[PDB]
Subunit: 125 residues, 4 copies
């Protein structure tokens, strides 16, 4: 699962970028982290990300063409890997070492017996 960190870096970073870039023009979505976070959560969610944010951004900032497309990909490519990361961390460790406690003592037991039958081998001398 924890990516969870990475994701909260990506999420963190992209916001600070956006708030740097756009906040001048788009204080609505990008004036502060306060809304850049939301906005990128909203973009993460795919609720009116282009038609509602990106295209309208890009109407004055063509460079953002990538900022939105990128973040979406990057985001979904880590949530691809975290959603599947809990598919594997749910599908199974321990069954190994409890029968090396048995066997590596059962052996010890037979050495004990062998020197107890052999203690009555010393036993006649």
């Amino acid at each position: 699962i924890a990516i969870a960190l990475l994701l909260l870096v990506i999420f963190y970073v992209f916001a600070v970028m956006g708030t740097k870039l756009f906040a001048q023009s788009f204080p609505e979505w990008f004036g502060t982290l306060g809304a850049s976070m939301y906005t990128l959560f909203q973009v993460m969610t795919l609720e009116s990300w282009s038609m509602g944010i990106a295209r309208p951004v890009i109407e004055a900032y063509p460079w953002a063409w990538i900022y939105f497309v990128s973040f979406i990909l990057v985001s979904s490519f880590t949530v691809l890997n975290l959603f599947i990361g809990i598919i594997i961390e749910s599908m199974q460790i321990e069954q190994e070492q409890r029968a090396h406690d048995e066997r590596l003592e059962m052996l010890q037991l037979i050495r004990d017996l062998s020197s107890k039958v052999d203690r009555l081998e010393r036993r006649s001398g």
Copy 2:
């Protein structure tokens, strides 16, 4: 998995009663009653115009809600993450594992029996 089914129907239930408490004054449309707060939260659950269409417009008068929506979404998707995957595991489908701790944990018993049988014939 369907232990969650309950939980989810609590989350779903609860969040609605909150919203209907909060917003219904301002947003009777989406929040006037459970009747529509249930829908609305289903709709927010669905991610069809949740922010642009509900939340941001809520938040225009209630900055409080900033979390109410973001939260519910997360909470919801994190239980449906776990229920959808809960049906991935409840669908997917051995014994010889505990059958060699029945061997070893009796083979041991056998060597103790021998050790007190070799030891039983030591006194003699």
Copy 3:
């Protein structure tokens, strides 16, 4: 996989319902199967299903409150089961049965030793 049928029944049926119901008021989305199919594909997709279709429907038809919510659920619950239906239809020794030839004879050996007895 083939549910594929069922789904195409659900999908089929719900359209014929909607086109019966709404087409009067909402010929836009429901005037014919032609657009009721699309519309229900669009509702299946969760692109402006409520805000864009359902709520606006329901503004004159409160009965639809279920028609949309229902279809969505029903749909996702069959696509839940078909997408997972391809997760299972897609997921396609002696080292374990040997250590019960060593052990179930090593035992025999210790019984043989133990019947070392006067």
Copy 4:
């Protein structure tokens, strides 16, 4: 995983179609690959694909009824198969022969004991 190619063909192709078709009427979304790529990414994303693009296209091009519905299906059916393609690939040692070092010597030990008891039960009557 790599479909990744196929997908980038589908994605590529459909854009060139759309840009052929619509870029007369809808230079907005279809004037160049530049925006037909985005647009098809946006349609891939299911953010206002019909209500925002397709229906509005189709208001003048009933042809497109399929172009959108098709691409969506085709897209999601390859991403169905690539997302599940990573459920099987990045999802799905030695202790095996380490307990035949134990067992195939523990046996040796019991033969050693058996000829050691053979030693002294013989050697004590």
